[PDB]
Amino acid sequence: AWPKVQPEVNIGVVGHVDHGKTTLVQAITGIWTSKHSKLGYAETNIGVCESCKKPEAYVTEPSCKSCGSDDEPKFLRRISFIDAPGHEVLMATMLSGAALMDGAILVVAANEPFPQPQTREHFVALGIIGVKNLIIVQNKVDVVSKEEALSQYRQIKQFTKGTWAENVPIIPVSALHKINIDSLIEGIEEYIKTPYRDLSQKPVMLVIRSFDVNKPGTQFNELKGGVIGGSIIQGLFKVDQEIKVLPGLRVEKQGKVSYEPIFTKISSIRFGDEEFKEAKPGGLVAIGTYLDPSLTKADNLLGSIITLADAEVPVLWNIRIKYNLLERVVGAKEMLKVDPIRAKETLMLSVGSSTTLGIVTSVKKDEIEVELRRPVAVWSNNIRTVISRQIAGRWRMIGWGLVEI
Ligand SMILES: Nc1nc2c(ncn2[C@@H]2O[C@H](COP(=O)(O)OP(=O)(O)O)[C@@H](O)[C@H]2O)c(=O)[nH]1
Ligand SMILES: [Mg+2]
């Protein structure tokens, strides 16, 4: 019997619309992520049939029938996938990507010219947020000749050559007909390994959703505290731990604007449909709390950072960022130059995957100083920052950096 454990790794699935992201996640997990009426999420166990040859030995359920054996397969690990509905939701979650994803799959349709517009954008975005454990999946090989597939494969290798992605593998599949999916599972095991995690690091969690789960007319004894949804960035949380929500509540007192942390306690921990006593990075987690549900209703806490109640975590209104920029971005028409950062500019800053607006107060060499609309939690040195600028009416990623404390 396979164990019941949390996912230990989260994989973002990106690529141009209709290239087959959701079909691919279904082929792997058996789950259709967009059966909802907001992020698609799906988990699967991964195993291997010890006496079978690879890649067919790799399986996603406890059976070896797919490789002609009656044996029970060995359990390797549980993994999960993030699959967004549409470009705008996807790009929005990419701003939190570093916290959410241990790796990524870029889906490329074999029957469309490469690269498609969102293909280019998603690939650039992955570099910016630093999620570079990448697999490129060449999908829909069932509707082109082997020659056409081979030709596109070589275009892609030419594209990645000279970039950070030069050594990224390309795995051809048909998500629809489940062809060569076992090769992809094998590739996930090789190229998106579970990271080394130092579980003695101070616990930090990003909040991506918050809920009031009480139906109307719920009686007193059946009421629940506010529920928080998110991803554990580092460390380990436990049931019954005291925690605080950062920066907290915005307050106007003694002639100043300030933020007061929200203190509470973890009542329960859930991954998918199982309850746990602890929670580590990997997977999206649901945290039950003792919060008044009015504080969590309608994603009120979205973008909060959660730590233990006594954590020494600075919450800063002004930050210094050491950064680098893109040379150009793709305009709807054609290439737009990325202008240097100038004082007084308004930027969107994603700091350790929590996002706010800010005004540049100083620029020198490769550092900026920014005054933020609300303050950000900074729990270590070299917290990665995404810098975005409004270009032609839209926020665009233009750079990345590290927060210097
Ligand atoms: N022929 C073929 N069609 C596919 C394959 N994978 C997906 N499709 C089709 O492509 C369309 C878009 O797929 P979908 O998973 O919704 O793409 P997404 O927008 O990237 O999530 C659907 O009609 C799928 O059935 C494949 O491997 N072969
Ligand atoms: Mg989809």
Structural write-up:
This protein has a seven-stranded mixed sheet, sandwiched between helices. It is built from six helices and 24 strands. The protein is mainly β and 405 residues long. The protein has helices at residues 21-29, 87-94, 97-100, 117-129, 146-160, 181-191; strands spanning 9-14, 40-48, 58-59, 74-83, 103-109, 134-139, 170-172, 204-211, 227-234, 237-238, 242-253, 256-271, 274-276, 278-279, 285-289, 305-308, 315-325, 328-329, 336-337, 346-351, 354-364, 367-377, 383-391, 394-403. Magnesium ion (MG) is lined by residues 21-22, 34. It is classed as translation. The entry lists the keywords Rossmann fold, translation.
Overall geometric form: globular
Spell out which ligands are present. Answer: guanosine-5'-diphosphate, magnesium ion
Range of helix content: 10-25%
CATH architecture assignment name of the largest domain:
3-Layer(aba) Sandwich
Strand content: 35-45%
Largest sheet: 7 strands, mixed
Provide the succession of SSEs.
EHEEEHHEHEHEHEEEEEEEEEEEEEEEEE
Please identify the top-level CATH class of the largest domain. Alpha Beta
Structural class: mainly beta
- What would you give as the CATH superfamily of the largest domain? P-loop containing nucleotide triphosphate hydrolases
Number of domains: 3
How far is the N terminus from the C terminus?
Answer: 48 Å
**Total number of helices:** 6
Compute the number of strand runs.
24
Evaluate the radius of gyration.
22 Å
CATH-derived topology of the largest domain: Rossmann fold
Q: How is the largest sheet built, in terms of strand order?
A: 3-2-4-1-5-6-7
